[PDB]
Write a protein that binds this ligand. Structure first.
Ligand SMILES: C[C@]12CC[C@H]3[C@@H](CCC4=CC(=O)CC[C@@]43C)[C@@H]1CC[C@@H]2O
Ligand SMILES: C[C@]12CC[C@H]3[C@@H](CCC4=CC(=O)CC[C@@]43C)[C@@H]1CC[C@@H]2O
Lengths: 278, 278
């Protein structure tokens, strides 16, 4: 039978491209449940699916809001096969700005969607995998989950949290036959100045501008095509003994090694301040 | 004048012992605001304060619930000096058990207290430090924030999140004169089987027992006295150029280095499964 895949956050970006890559696979090996918070956003997904000639029935959309455990359970019940071979936890939110300028609701939302929503997915689908002794779980990671980035304090908190969540589960899941992997992505092709200025000091504001200018230059130079990133997920899926982490690029490994080599954090803080700010 | 210190989570453990260490310092250098979620739990703190003969006025208690930004702001207004020289973000919750056995509320609470509550403290007190160009922020960390531990999935998610939060802020704060440091603690001297069994499978349940037996043995062998741990906070406070991280012990550095040296995570997962389970 087909490998049943359920992917969260398929309205755009990595989840959209992964969903159509799998559904359009020439071997027709996969049945994909592409889940979205709001079905009103499914148009780009269906435009992409048609462009790759996904066979009828290879791709289905479900509404799934990872903030709501009832929505998670209702989507699980919509899997007609009664099993999920591959779960891809990809839904996520970004949050950029001076820490004191971020709304309390926005902070709590990033954590609820990125972290608690992944926990909700894992609590809903892991038990069936553990009892069957098979299943693959892929989690969309970021280089921001491996090293702290200025003005991404809460985003990095949430991506570092997925690292701890997944590494902790991987230690237990080792002998269960259930494989969990993080796909560590760099940049991928996919408030107003006035309000930020009102909630922070002028120096922090100026540094935010510098960060934004630097970020745009790196994105322009180094963002990867979503097709190349989606193929790393497929590589992890086909591995007989998948590792805990896959990297979409080796570009940030040097910064990572410097980080990991000086546990006091001094070398990394100095190097990243220089890298972003000059 | 005195160095004004505000510490969260002083009802027991590290925060209680730190508060009385600082308030009883022979030099009388510190004025300590020991904050607690519920003032009904302040008895051990006052028993400890009297035992160390903390001078009258060296220690004051404030009610502060880090889940509530109004409580954070009301406590900030109670600092009569109108400034905080040292902020110690220590309030935290643990959560242990099979992931699928944890209540959704309990998960969301660990994240709200440990992560969003620290963000609330930083948003409330950082701006004044940045404008003055001085201030120390100490955050209670854990070895569980540096490496994933089985059956601590959500606890480790939350402690890994503080790593990302603090490292991201430290990159920005470098030139502001505001110093942020994590104090990485190992074990420190400080649901029912039936309900866990009903929410998980028998194999996971057996592994939980093994984890608990192992954890108790390590705690018995390696837990540090809270006095020794509190003194690491003082060491970070007195450093002219404090590093991002301080370690209370070097016992877990080897596991950490192995972790950091194999970015795929394979060596760490295998080593920690063997370390916990045999
Ligand atoms: C900060 C940074 C440039 C901006 C990058 C960041 C990695 C992650 C990232 C993803 C994006 O989509 C926007 C650009 C950013 C935010 C990079 C890591 C090192 C580099 O200097
Ligand atoms: C899991 C472990 C034993 C139990 C330790 C853990 C570090 C943190 C910790 C703190 C505690 O208070 C309980 C014991 C635990 C949970 C250790 C890290 C490696 C060691 O094998």
């Amino acid at each position: 039978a087909r490998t049943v895949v359920l992917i969260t956050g398929c309205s755009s970006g990595i989840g959209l491209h992964l969903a159509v890559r799998l559904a359009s696979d020439p071997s027709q090996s996969f049945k994909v449940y592409a889940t979205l918070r709001d079905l009103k956003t499914q148009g780009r997904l269906w435009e992409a699916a048609r462009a790759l000639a996904c066979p009828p029935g290879s791709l289905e959309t479900l509404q799934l809001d990872v903030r709501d455990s009832k929505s998670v359970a209702a989507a699980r019940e919509r899997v007609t096969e009664g099993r999920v071979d591959v779960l891809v936890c990809n839904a996520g939110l970004g949050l950029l700005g001076p820490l004191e300028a971020l709304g309390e609701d926005a902070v709590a939302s990033v954590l609820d969607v990125n972290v608690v929503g992944t926990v909700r997915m894992l609590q809903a689908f892991l038990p069936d995998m553990k009892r069957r002794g098979s299943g693959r779980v892929l989690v969309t990671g970021s280089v921001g989950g491996l090293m702290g980035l200025p003005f991404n304090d809460v985003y990095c908190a949430s991506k570092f949290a997925l690292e701890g969540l997944c590494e902790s589960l991987a230690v237990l899941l080792l002998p269960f036959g259930v494989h969990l992997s993080l796909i560590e992505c760099g940049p991928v092709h996919t408030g107003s100045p006035e309000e930020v200025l009102d909630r922070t000091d002028i120096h922090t504001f100026h540094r935010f501008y510098q960060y934004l200018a630097h970020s745009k230059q790196v994105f322009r130079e180094a963002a990867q095509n979503p097709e190349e990133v989606a193929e790393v997920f497929l590589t992890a899926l086909r591995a007989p003994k998948p590792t805990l982490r896959y990297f979409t690029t080796e570009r940030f490994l040097p910064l990572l090694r410097m980080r990991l080599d000086d546990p006091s954090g001094s070398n990394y803080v100095t190097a990243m301040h220089r890298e972003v700010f000059g």
